[model samples]
Target: PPLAPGQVLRIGDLCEFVEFPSQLLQVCGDSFAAPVALHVDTESIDDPVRYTGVTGVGTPLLADPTPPGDSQLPAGVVQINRRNYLMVTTTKDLQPQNSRLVRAEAARGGWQTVSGSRRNAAYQDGRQTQISGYYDPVPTPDSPTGWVYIVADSFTRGEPAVLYRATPESFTDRSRWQGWAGGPDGGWNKPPTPLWPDQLGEMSIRQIDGQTVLSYFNASTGNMEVRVAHHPTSLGAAPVTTVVRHRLAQPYGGYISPGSTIDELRIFVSVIQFAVNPFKPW
Candidate 1:
């Protein structure tokens, strides 16, 4: 939640804050996006495990393992613009033609929807239908929310992996999603232009030397790869022609997909556990 004006939040003041976009969680019967927050009133000994619920049962991000689409609402959280929000991705279905990229968010207390009748927030989509696996770039001095990056699987038989970008607002409008990435008369089927042709997978991005460099893992070759783009948000600029590649120690777990979150930048191969990177910006 955005802190109260000059309220000076401190540690151990546990409270509920906003998480992911409530609308996009259409597939799951319930929203697992309402996560908990632990304040830093003081920097002393703390046992997160001991923070139990009224029933004495451990609070879990998702008690049961939800399928492919479920990971969209990642267990961890990211803070942006003085407030922390869950980064949620959703797909109505993952089938070839149906797979989609949906980004969702829930503000602190979900903008007071409970007063109507319900007492909690519901999962929903903000912007969706470009691809799966996304990354939020560092906001330029001009736009604080920053642009979102997307990487999706090929929709047609012979198509290749594609990359796209859109402002935070553009990402939410329905009229913009279908063609947000691809320019006029372009979208999933015809990406208009692909940053990296014939490729896609889990990826991360950083601004190095005034250029946006993208790092990703290749499923086909099991290599950690990097690409430098000429433009931060325009596809018209040429991306890296020669992608730098390094052999991976081992393939990512079959169940482990790319673009998990910032906590995952170090790259550990195992069942992913819930994590929070307080330093990572949305």
Candidate 2:
């Protein structure tokens, strides 16, 4: 249940936000595309857990179409490039004759729907398609609510992992999401996001007080820093947000399949206790 605006968010205030989109993009073949991104998390702990869960859960950003066509591609296919932009270029039945690119936009300030379109992978072809991130966050906390987090899903078939957050309302409405800061994303009305290198595509992300935060690790660069992006600020000047990169020393054991909300995050930790097989099987 949602609390009042003035309500005090407790330390152990737990909630779960679920979305079906989290499970839709589970494609395994493409290196450039974001094969389904599972849920990820960020917590309000004074001492947060560094690594936990096998299948971390984060909110869904977008989903492909259903019921593929009679072609090379399966229904609802997405394509991305080394540039890190993503979008669905072809239908499953049609099979992508060309590698089209989609542009992404994060809108903020009470938006009901998201905006933008994708180009057919074939640069020579003048084709366009639309992809929408429509999954709602069932357990979303309110705007003024306390901190929330997501855990990236396990890398099944080299699936990319991501951890991110958003305002409470964004769970149900796309408009509440923050818009992009500076660069091509400057004009966006919603929340801005942090862009990562090609190795970090399909990254799971959430914002901490309007700033972009990423917890996934980059393979090419053996390091992590607060991701920085230029954005409009209170003074109407461009400012930057720091990005944090995390290398996987600890393995995730949350859930194995696509998950919604933080349910997988908690279940993974308590798996030993809830087992009919029992933890020690004693």
Candidate 3:
């Protein structure tokens, strides 16, 4: 008999799909991509995210490594050769509006991200309005103390948005809260050059030659760039910019990334497809 139309699972369920490489799924639409709550049953669900290999009798299982916050949602993922990936989502704004920002991560047994950060600030009028901080001597190379997370809420008045840093273990760590930026007067402000970041990308912090380098995709030039600044005690004046900016592009961009690195400076490229019906594949 055919799989009960619209219905899933009858009894004894098992993963059938063999291979469906987890993708970043760079979303290309202007719709709200609501997230789902995933509950992982490691013993039974080999990989709840395995979307292509087997044809199970039941629906796709859901798992959540940690509790959800704000609008954070369960990430679709797949494991291969003892490797794990955190499915990332990306979107572009066609309307005459501000850019957008997205997020994602990879979990160990439960869901978790390595190092994820995005532009927490934005450019204002004439001066540098919103601002982000540099890594204050990250504990170890490639290992960040926490993540600098930002949400592009599209602000219009003073204090466009915020640039905050957070940690995976927990969010109460005061040290993780990088800080906010603004103008001197109790009025409006503008950000520095390379003003706005490509809302679709994430920022990374690295320790190279014992110097902290802030890594991110320069939306100003549509090029991958890096800047170094010494943030002592996680407190200091804003970083100074210079000419001769680095211009490189990531392969799997247009979505969030782990920003994991090997030689202090590396590339992150993820590929995925996630478009609902009525929407054509790109």
List the candidate 2 regions with Cα displacement exceeding 4 Å: 1-18, 21-118, 122-199, 208-211, 217-219, 222-282
Least lDDT summed over 10 consecutive residues: which range in candidate 2?
Answer: 273-282
Report the C-alpha lDDT of model 1 over 1-282, residue by residue, as the tens digit. Answer: 332211211122111222233211111222221222332211111222121122101342322233544322222122223233233232234322122222223321221111121111111121122233233556866457666554433321123345445455554332332322455665442333554444444443444334444444455555444344544344324332212233224432111112223232222222121221212111
What tens digits encode model 2's per-residue C-alpha lDDT throughout 1-282?
Answer: 333211212112101122232222221123222223323333311233222222212332334322233121111211111112233334343334332222222221111111333233432112112111212223423434532232222121122222223343332222233333446645334333333222322222333234322222343443221231221121122121112223223222211112212111112211110101101101
On the 0 to 100 scale, the lDDT of residue 44 in model 3 is: 33
Q: Write the per-residue lDDT of candidate 3 for residues 1-282, one digit (tens) a residue.
A: 232211212121000111113332221211232233223222332222222222111421223221222222211222222233333222222111221112222221222343442222232331111122223323534236633332221221222223443343333232344333434531111222222333312333433344444444344354333444343222123232211123222322211122322222322222221111110111
Between candidates 1 and 2, which one is better according to lDDT? 1
Local accuracy by lDDT, each model: 0.31, 0.25, 0.27
RMSD each, Å: 12.9, 15.7, 16.3
Give candidate 3 regions above 4 Å deviation: 1-162, 166-178, 182-200, 232-264, 269-282
Is 1 or 3 the stronger prediction by lDDT?
1
lDDT of 2: 0.25
Winning model by TM-score:
1
Give model 1 RMSD, 1 decimal: 12.9
What lDDT does candidate 3 reach at residue 77?
A: 26
- The TM-scores of all predictions, comma-separated, are 0.40, 0.26, 0.33
